[PDB]
Amino acid sequence: LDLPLDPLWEFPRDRLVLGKPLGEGCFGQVVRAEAFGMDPARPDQASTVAVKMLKASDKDLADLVSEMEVMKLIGRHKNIINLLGVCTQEGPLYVIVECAAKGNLREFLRARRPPRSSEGPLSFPVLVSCAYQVARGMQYLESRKCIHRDLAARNVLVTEDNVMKIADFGLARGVHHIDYYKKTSNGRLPVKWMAPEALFDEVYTHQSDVWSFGILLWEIFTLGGSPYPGIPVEELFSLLREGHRMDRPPHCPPELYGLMRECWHAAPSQRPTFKQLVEALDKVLLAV
């Protein structure tokens, strides 16, 4: 408490009904919720939102406050998870964002793996659209000087209308104390998304995010596959020092594997920019 009141963002906590937790092992810090009157022109209208709360140290408060203020600054875009409001007065700190109903893109793809017996849910144009939308979101974040630093399919959320929304672009990443052997409770090894300059030299640019986007492209066109399959972290270190790159996935046209390999060029200036990736993927989508 004793946080400043920002009337542009403050939302009455009694207009929230907190619901079931999100994430896997977060001690009830992020929950689904219903909000009433998030649109002040429809004060009684319900909507589904997501709420993040503390618990907590003085540092924990400052981290969330900083994460909140980052979202305030970055502004709104169709392909990111947008801040909707905050509860800072007369109670616990809440940060309210959009709820993307279908969950993260990795789980979305894996659950959709294949008269229409030969037709799985996911067609090539819709896979390209997913990649294009993420590229557009990332191009927006870069224009606002935001480096994501862990861009991955697990950090892209999918709305009821299959819109991609980049999540956690404003989360603290503790880049100076990453356990490179860390395996998440879902079995993910996040070191597998890190650009070499980040992993080896602790340098991040927008071009490091471009590297991770290449890994994300590979996840899309393997319908949520795990990158560097079967390669433990110790071997990944030596393979990246030798310049190893992932193989072309099955059922993946050369245009897309081409984009992947460009995103993994050693020199960051020889990777495409997000603006170039948007245009390249746009051409593929228009090719139908």
Ligand SMILES: C=CC(=O)Nc1ccc(-n2nc3c(=O)[nH]nc(N)c3c2-c2oc3ccc(C)cc3c2C)cc1
């Ligand atoms: C300990 C690890 C952990 O916490 N892991 C986790 C992973 C995903 C989600 N998650 N999942 C969805 C989803 O499926 N649809 N829509 C969402 N907004 C979703 C969110 C979500 O909610 C938020 C509310 C406020 C802020 C500031 C950020 C978020 C995020 C990212 C929550 C927790």
